[PDB]
Amino acid sequence: IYAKFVSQKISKTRWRPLPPGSLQTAETFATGSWDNEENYISLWSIGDEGDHQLLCDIRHHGDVMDLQFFDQERIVAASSTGCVTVFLHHPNNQTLSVNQQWTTAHYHSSAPCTGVVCNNPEIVTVGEDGRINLFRADHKEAVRTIDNADSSTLHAVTFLRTPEILTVNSIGQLKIWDFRQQGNEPSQILSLTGDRVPLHCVDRHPNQQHVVATGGQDGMLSIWDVRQGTMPVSLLKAHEAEMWEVHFHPSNPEHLFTCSEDGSLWHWDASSWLSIEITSLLPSRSLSVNTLDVLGPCLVCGTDAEAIYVTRHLFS
Amino acid sequence: FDFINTDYKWEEIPSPHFTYLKDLDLGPCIGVHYDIRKAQEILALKRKEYEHSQLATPEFLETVELEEKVLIEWLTVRNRANLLLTARLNLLQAWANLLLVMIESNDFKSTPKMAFLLQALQAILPTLEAFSSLKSDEAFELARVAKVLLWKLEQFTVGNLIGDKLFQLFQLCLSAISQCSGTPELRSLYYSICYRYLTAVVDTRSVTNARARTLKAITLYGDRLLNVICDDAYGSDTTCQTAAMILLNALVHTSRASVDCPIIDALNRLNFIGVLVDSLKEILNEWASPSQQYTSAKLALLLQLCQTRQGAKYVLQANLFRALEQSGVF
Amino acid sequence: NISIDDAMAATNLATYVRLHPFSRVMEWLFNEKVITSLINTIHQDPISLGSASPDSPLVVSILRAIQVMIKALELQETYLHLVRPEVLRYQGEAGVRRKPVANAAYSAFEDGILSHLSLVVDLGKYCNLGHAELT
Amino acid sequence: MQPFDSGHDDLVHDVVYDFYGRHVATCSSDQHIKVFKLDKDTSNWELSDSWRAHDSSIVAIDWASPEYGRIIASASYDKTVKLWEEDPDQEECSGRRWNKLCTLNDSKGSLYSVKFAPAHLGLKLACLGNDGILRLYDALEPSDLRSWTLTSEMKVLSIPPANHLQSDFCLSWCPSRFSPEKLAVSALEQAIIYQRGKDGKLHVAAKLPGHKSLIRSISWAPSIGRWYQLIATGCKDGRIRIFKITEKLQSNLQVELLSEHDDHNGEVWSVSWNLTGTILSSAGDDGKVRLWKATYSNEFKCMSVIT
Amino acid sequence: ILVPMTVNDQPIEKNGDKMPLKFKLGPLSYQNMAFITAKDKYKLYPVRIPRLDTSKEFSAYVSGLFEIYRDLGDDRVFNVVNSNFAKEHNATVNLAMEAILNELEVFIGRVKDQDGRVNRFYELEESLTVLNCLRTMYFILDGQDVEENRSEFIESLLNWINRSDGEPDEEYIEQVFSVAGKKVFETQYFWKLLNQLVLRGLLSQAIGCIERSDLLPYLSDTCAVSFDAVSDSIELLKQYPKDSSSTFREWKNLVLKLSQAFGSSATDISGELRDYIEDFLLVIGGNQRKILQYSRTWYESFCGFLLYYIPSLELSAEYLQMSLEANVVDITNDWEQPCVDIISGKIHSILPVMESLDSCTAAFTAMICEAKGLIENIFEGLEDLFSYRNGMASYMLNSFAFELCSLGDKELWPVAIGLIALSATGTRSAKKMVIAELLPHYPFVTNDDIEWMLSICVEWRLPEIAKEIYTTLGNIESIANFSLVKSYSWLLFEASCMEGQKVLNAIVSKDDVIIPQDILVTNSMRQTLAPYAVLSQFYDREDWGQALRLLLLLIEFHYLVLLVAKFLYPIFEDSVATVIEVIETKWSNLYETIIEADKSATLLKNLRKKLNFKLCQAFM
């Protein structure tokens, strides 16, 4: 593992997906920054302390609240302004452009878009206005908006099986929605009783469409099975401050990764979550780790120390 | 002598990704001649099976097509490379035979031809350095020519260039012996080269500097080098074991001239002295003939170890008195 | 086909080999009359070829005869291997009335032509004509 | 994988899997046909649709090859055979998810079985009833799934006595793709095989001797890999039988009996095969299901007993 | 094997009218079904085939083994670069045997960690023990003796023995290092457990148990003589040769010298400790009598014999016999007897039993046994594979493949088809047929899955199969994607109707570049022409050209003709007249409806229009 310092606090880091049938491991990643007068979306490649090459960047107005790859060349960003944008990478001349955008995806006046997930051609967003949008590439207006879906702040979203999704909010509720539904109420609510601890992140198990992991204000990892009643299947003590992201490893989901405000990034190894050894990967002097992404043996993360940490050799 | 060039990299080949058809080997294809139809039929059957599977058959067809178009050219390039390699091998063998016939049958003076000798040495130096451990076919033709050349041997300038290359040529020999490269035949020629070098060249401030630096090269490898030489002895080949046995005599001999010695100590740790004294039994059966000359070097080596004070300790502990009695030679 | 593939297409190849006249042509090639006529046509005086034109029918006929001989020498093995046994088995199984026109003594095509010594002499003499194809 | 209610009021006669094994069709005496779906997420079976399809007891059912669409066929005691096609543009459980595509009334007696033919022969099917007459139907134009013509009629039984409640008939096509068209038929104590002739007509090519009572079930096994055919039968005399049929009184078919098994001690009601014809199943009076594998010697051995 | 169909709701009770139970095997191994044709019995019972492996660990195991099988290349076959082909053949095969062993160990591990049932773990370890023994005896020395390669052999042997059973388990080490009624460590227990350790090659532990109690204590004080014995004996133990059969020859020398010296010397210790030290030295020296005496199980004896007496397999026959005279085979576990069989030469007749433990392992086992040449196809004869005609290994592998096909795991389907394709026996056409029948059942979902299927149809030439698969896929956007003859015609007609009624797809016919490349038929061309005509219409001479194109299309083809007439009327020279004429010459409910929609009689209107056109031509 190694660090690179990049002169901006990094809110989001995502690997570019690999071409179908590639035998190579991930080498290109996107970042989004926050807390600057000028924030940026940036694309980077790793050469074979590493050597990083800035491929291109583009000014992003607002803090980058979330970021996902839609396909090889398209990157979707959520702004603190409530704008949702699809950026397009042009590899021939290494430029970024705006492909399409929904400037009023979230609003009250401006309301931050807090989460975006992609399942090409669909894009789903949530925000502090408690609005949930389904967008489709090249459609100017939302396919569906669930106005005033949640009365609490929506912090994150995941697909279950499209057009079904699950959201997490600031009072610790998981809510399940379908864009075909009538009304503004969820089909199912799950939550831990006692303290209504805010949930900041959620990820669906890549193979088991019924299973999700969440991270909370209290640093805890929760595993849920939406067929198994309203409480989590597992509740595990973890970080000393907020957990900002949680990711199952895409190809071997016995491995799961979490990062926190307390400056740690954990690799959890259950090799099943229904039904554990943990390694902390960053040094003891880290500021908030805001974001991580994992693909194959490659991990990238971004911190409030204006640092990106990478390993391309997680398992070797 | 401009046909030997490794810059083209005829041996190295850029292997594409081949995300598909990777498991299709050239077993039934193979006189190195890889038939293209043997693989064409296999890839056609595989394409038919994939199409029958009914899983994205139209889209992924172009991938298989381009993979086949790359595999056919890969096979042709491999065949052409094999042909070029065998042609270069034949040409090098012919050139070596011509050079040997020229050097052997030459009544003309040697002091005028010393220039051509040094030029040939300079030309072969990079050839040997580039094929020291790559292949065991080109070194053979180039290893024997250097052997005879070393035995068939203003003056100060020439004497320095000769001794300089003889020292460099001594390094690449011990380097190959430490790695056990090539066949026992090629490994035998290296023993003769290092033998005369440590017997004639080194054997007077100039002598001390050469002897000192010479021992450094031997100590660099350590037991790794001696282990290979000890295994060659009492082996299957008849000439390799003989040259290897005589080689050890020069090492211990030149080491004493440099009251102890690290060479003799290493032989004891490698269990060489132990097995050596054991072979003394039934010596009557072994003893012009190849077996006779081999035994001469064997007993000759033991005689050298009994001259140093430290040898009596290791040699006496081997119980040689009982080994020479079972043979009934006396 | 029969060793790996199914027995469906076997009937197609069988019908092709049985109906194609290649077998009958090969059988006729083993006759003494054919080779005698061929060597008589190829054995001609040199003055005629010398005074003849490059487009003369004699040169074209000699070229066609040499090409037929080459094709026969090339395909004799393939025939004797994969035609004769199949045709014999078919004639034995089914009912076919055919008259043999081949000589059993001539085990190969060379047996019928090894008795002509002037053939090589004529072939060598025909090299001084200049015709590229014939040469 | 816990049991579940079918939703039928009267006894259930047949259950059949679709091609992918993710769907199931059920038919009962309450004159209904139910279709169940195997939800991906929650590995539970859940009713896709139910509907009234006949005026009498529905005894047999079967799915057609997926390469012809979503098609089910039913046979009832009301002397008819009906064909249905799923209309994906309808809500599940609406009772209107499967549209009748046709009705076959040619039978003048109740019907006991109906089986689709192997896909490599087009939409084809067979049926057999009290009239003791096997009938083959063909959907000649694969576009018109209503254009059902009658391809053939064969008299299996010759003189069925007008006073017997004791009646059973079964069908089973030879699944084999690289073998001449043929199908097995059971009628009471008898069991005979039909084969397509050069004249495009069905002929009796053999009989499976040995049954000393009523044949409750028969099924042709998938001959993937083998050069021979295997058909099993569950008789009322309490014996499972496995016949080896090879093609080398007017037949081109040989008939071997490979195995006999009475392990059930009572009637064997159901006999079914693997998708690979690697496993054979049997069920009967003893309230037990038995799974059979073939030995290296081609004998058959019970690899497990469920209950 | 008797398993409860449903350990919840059992559908029967008394012999109360033996009910008609019915069962149907499903396309998926893990999803079959049972039911009953009786009154008040309307439940359906989904049943999965007894002892079926659905776990991920298993598929991992399968993939690993297939990798080993595939990687074996030409070496998976045995030929009944001259004398080396043999030795190198065994080299690689013997290695493959190690790989299989490994993969099975890993599997067994992952089964112990992620588990509901641990019975599977136990069975898999047993399978491993037996396989270790098999390698140690046939997969290292290739028929030669231990001198051929002392290092590898002793390594495998020492491995086999210390993985077969757990004892001496550290739960028993402390068991005696705790028990008293005697002075320190000096009862039959300490020594038995010291000798046990030695017999199993566990020299490290052996040494430890000594430096635990009276190495220096009781001995360095009481008897200085036996202290030297007990000490440099531990020294010899510290240097037991494992690479040179020479060093061992000399080792046993120093050991026998030590045992003789101590044998007759100063007895300054207890009557019992005296012998207790002699026995230890005898065992280390290789005394047969003693090696048998301190052995708890036959394999301890056998192992000891090979380690301290004479390291020659030429005596294994005798060793085993003595071992079995001391301790009979323990029928508690299933691995001991098979090991005895291995050692004693009769390797065969294990395939059926292993097939009972696990089909997969048995399959590949038979395979590598064929690779070694330990079993071969004796048959010498019917146009197909899945029989006794080919090998016993071929048979088991092909069987496994077929079994994998019903498992419904698309990850293993490549393994199944690959297994069949690489089968060292059977015509390419026979395999062609088998794949032709299996492939249609592939549980494809992704695009890639389908492309894989197709790639296999290509690779094997199954156009009728691919055509069928695709047919299944075809069954507005979907139709557009599809664009058999009748269907194409219908699509054409639909396109024409749409045109008459009147986006990206249409332009492509006339991201985008990729689509154009993919496109790069008659129906399609017609639609493209219609689109061009409409474009021209949207854009006088152009209009005429479009009308001409339309007339030409109508000639090539009732509804279309009506649409054309409507267009002509809306528009309202010699070529035009000729076209109009041809149309009149060419000139049902749907057509009438279309006509009515357009108006919102037809033949008459058409005739009137034609007359008008003729008049116009005359005026011109």
Residues 6+ apart with CB under 8 A from B30: none
How far, in Å, CA of E175 to CA of E152, rounded?
34
A105 and A52 Cβ atoms separated by less than 8 Å: no
Q: What are E143's two structure tokens?
A: 């028929």
How far, in Å, CA of E476 to CA of E492, rounded?
13
Instruction: State the nearest Cα–Cα gap between E391 and chain B, in angstroms.
Output: 21
Instruction: State the nearest Cα–Cα gap between E607 and chain A, in angstroms.
Output: 48
Q: Number of C:E CB contacts under 8 A?
A: 13
Between β-strands D300-306 and E2-3, what pairing exists: parallel, antiparallel or unpaired?
Answer: parallel
A78 and A84 Cβ atoms separated by less than 8 Å: yes
Spell out which residues of chain C touch residue E430, defining contact as CB-CB under 8 Å.
4
Instruction: Please name the residue ranges forming H helices in chain B.
Output: 37-53, 61-104, 114-130, 138-151, 155-179, 184-196, 205-221, 223-232, 239-257, 262-269, 272-278, 283-286, 290-305, 309-316, 320-326
How far, in Å, CA of A39 to CA of A80, rounded?
11
How far, in Å, CA of A76 to CA of E525, rounded?
39
Touching chains E and A? (3+ Cβ pairs < 8 A): yes
Yes or no, beta carbons of E456 and B274 under 8 Å apart? no
Yes or no, beta carbons of E421 and B60 under 8 Å apart? no
How far, in Å, CA of E565 to CA of E46, rounded?
63
A122 and A135 Cβ atoms separated by less than 8 Å: yes
The DSSP output letter for B200 is I
How far, in Å, CA of D196 to CA of E549, rounded?
51
Closest CA to E94 of E314, E374, E409: E374
Q: Tell the residue number behind the tokens 């112990």, with chain if given.
A: E112
Residues 6+ apart with CB under 8 A from E228: none
Closest CA to B6 of B127, B99, B187, B147: B127
D218 and D245 Cβ atoms separated by less than 8 Å: no
How far, in Å, CA of E94 to CA of E100, rounded?
10
Q: What are B123's two structure tokens?
A: 């030309």
Taking CA–CA distances from E464, the nearest residue in chain D reads D120
The DSSP output letter for E142 is T
Is the bond preceding D66 in cis, omega lying within 30 degrees of 0?
no
Mutation for testing the D interface, residue in A210, A225, A228 having most D CBs under 10 Å: A210
The DSSP output letter for E464 is H
Measured in degrees and rounded to the nearest 5, phi and psi for residue B86 equal: -65, -35
For residue B207, give the amino acid letter.
Answer: V
Nearest to B59 among E435, E451, E463 (CB): E451
Q: What are D56's two structure tokens?
A: 């009498």
Inform me whether the C-beta atom of residue D4 falls under 8 Å from chain E C-beta atoms: yes
How far, in Å, CA of A75 to CA of A86, rounded?
6
Half-sphere exposure of E295 (CA within 13 A, CB side): 30
Tell the burial category of E502 from Cβ atoms under 10 Å away from its Cβ (0-12, 13-18, 19+): exposed
How far, in Å, CA of A114 to CA of A169, rounded?
10
Q: Which residues pair with E577 in a beta bridge?
A: none
Taking CA–CA distances from A19, the nearest residue in chain B reads B19
Spell out which residues of chain A touch residue D40, defining contact as CB-CB under 8 Å.
161, 209
Measured in degrees and rounded to the nearest 5, phi and psi for residue E396 equal: -65, -35
Closest CA to A211 of A170, A256, A150, A145: A256
Dihedral angle sign, alpha carbons of residues A187, A190, A194, A197: negative
Task: Count CB atoms within 10 A of the CB of residue D6.
Answer: 24
Nearest to B54 among E73, E432, E470 (CB): E470
Inform me whether the C-beta atom of residue E554 falls under 8 Å from chain B C-beta atoms: no
Q: Number of A:E CB contacts under 8 A?
A: 5
Spell out which residues of chain E touch residue A20, defining contact as CB-CB under 8 Å.
448
Residues 6+ apart with CB under 8 A from B136: B181, B182, B183, B186
Mutation for testing the B interface, residue in A23, A24, A25 having most B CBs under 10 Å: A23
Helix (H) or strand (E) holding E560: helix E559-571
How far, in Å, CA of B79 to CA of E452, rounded?
31
SS3 label, residue B23: coil
Spell out which residues of chain B touch residue A19, defining contact as CB-CB under 8 Å.
none
Q: What are E548's two structure tokens?
A: 């001409």
How far, in Å, CA of E166 to CA of E158, rounded?
14
Contacts 24+ apart (CB under 8 A), D209-215: D209/D255, D210/D241, D210/D257, D210/D260, D211/D235, D211/D237, D211/D241, D212/D237, D213/D189, D213/D237, D214/D166, D214/D168, D214/D188, D214/D189, D214/D267, D215/D168, D215/D170, D215/D186, D215/D187, D215/D188, D215/D189, D215/D190, D215/D191
How far, in Å, CA of A306 to CA of E418, rounded?
50
Task: Please name the chains neighbouring D, where neighbouring means 3+ C-beta pairs under 8 angstroms.
Answer: A, E
Touching chains D and A? (3+ Cβ pairs < 8 A): yes
Touching chains B and E? (3+ Cβ pairs < 8 A): yes
Taking CA–CA distances from D70, the nearest residue in chain E reads E475
Residues 6+ apart with CB under 8 A from E403: D276, D278, E29, E359
Mutation for testing the A interface, residue in D39, D41, D46, D91 having most A CBs under 10 Å: D41
Radius of gyration of chain A (CA): 18
E406 and D274 Cβ atoms separated by less than 8 Å: yes
SS3 label, residue B180: coil
How far, in Å, CA of B320 to CA of B280, rounded?
8
How far, in Å, CA of B185 to CA of B225, rounded?
17
Spell out which residues of chain E touch residue B43, defining contact as CB-CB under 8 Å.
459
How far, in Å, CA of E503 to CA of E521, rounded?
19
The angle at the Cα of E276, spanning E273 to E279, to the nearest 5 degrees, equals 150
Inform me whether the C-beta atom of residue A280 falls under 8 Å from chain E C-beta atoms: no
- Give the residues after which the backbone of chain B is interrupted, taking a C-to-next-N distance over 2.5 angstroms as a break: 30, 153, 203, 258, 287
* CA separation, residue B92 to residues A98, B2, B145 (Å): 64, 11, 12
Q: Tell the residue number behind the tokens 């007696």, with chain if given.
A: D109
Instruction: Please name the residue ranges forming H helices in E167-305.
Output: 170-176, 188-199, 203-210, 220-221, 224-238, 245-263, 271-285, 288-293, 298-304
SS3 label, residue E561: helix
Q: What are D285's two structure tokens?
A: 């009076």
- Give the residues after which the backbone of chain D is interrupted, taking a C-to-next-N distance over 2.5 angstroms as a break: 248
Q: Number of D:E CB contacts under 8 A?
A: 200
Between β-strands D98-104 and A221-225, what pairing exists: parallel, antiparallel or unpaired?
Answer: unpaired
How far, in Å, CA of E200 to CA of E189, rounded?
17
Closest CA to A40 of A113, A81, A96: A96
Find residues 7-26 of chain D whose CB sits inside 8 Å of chain E. 7-22, 24, 26
The angle at the Cα of D71, spanning D68 to D74, to the nearest 5 degrees, equals 140
Radius of gyration of chain B (CA): 27
CA-CA-CA-CA torsion for B207, B208, B211, B215, nearest 10 degrees? -170
Taking CA–CA distances from E246, the nearest residue in chain B reads B275
E295 and E266 Cβ atoms separated by less than 8 Å: no
Nearest to E1 among D1, D14, D304 (CB): D304
Q: What are D120's two structure tokens?
A: 């490599």
Residues 6+ apart with CB under 8 A from B172: B128, B129, B132
Yes or no, beta carbons of A20 and E448 under 8 Å apart? yes
Mutation for testing the E interface, residue in D276, D279, D296 having most E CBs under 10 Å: D276
Task: Please name the chains neighbouring E, where neighbouring means 3+ C-beta pairs under 8 angstroms.
Answer: A, B, C, D
D158 and D132 Cβ atoms separated by less than 8 Å: yes
Q: What are A290's two structure tokens?
A: 């805001």
How far, in Å, CA of D73 to CA of D62, rounded?
5
D194 and D205 Cβ atoms separated by less than 8 Å: yes
Closest CA to D14 of D52, D44, D58, D48: D58
Q: What are E568's two structure tokens?
A: 């002509």
For residue D117, give the amino acid letter.
Answer: A
E120 and E326 Cβ atoms separated by less than 8 Å: no
Spell out which residues of chain E touch residue D264, defining contact as CB-CB under 8 Å.
none
Inform me whether the C-beta atom of residue C93 falls under 8 Å from chain E C-beta atoms: no
The DSSP output letter for E404 is H
DSSP helix, strand, coil percent of chain C (3-state; round to 5): 65, 0, 35
Residues of A with a Cβ under 8 Å from any D Cβ are 160-161, 209-210, 227
Stated in angstroms to one decimal place, the resolution of this structure is 37.0
A54 and A89 Cβ atoms separated by less than 8 Å: no
Taking CA–CA distances from A160, the nearest residue in chain D reads D41
Instruction: Please name the residue ranges forming H helices in E286-391.
Output: 288-293, 298-304, 316-326, 336-343, 351-357, 359-372
E132 and E101 Cβ atoms separated by less than 8 Å: yes
Nearest to B54 among E418, E439, E446 (CB): E439
DSSP annotation string for D212-248: -S-EEEEEEPP-SS-SSEEEEEEETTS-EEEEEEEE-
Residues 6+ apart with CB under 8 A from E145: E312, E313, E314
Dihedral angle sign, alpha carbons of residues E86, E90, E96, E97: positive
E329 and E337 Cβ atoms separated by less than 8 Å: yes
SS3 label, residue D111: strand
Touching chains A and C? (3+ Cβ pairs < 8 A): no
SS3 label, residue E31: strand
Q: Number of B:E CB contacts under 8 A?
A: 169
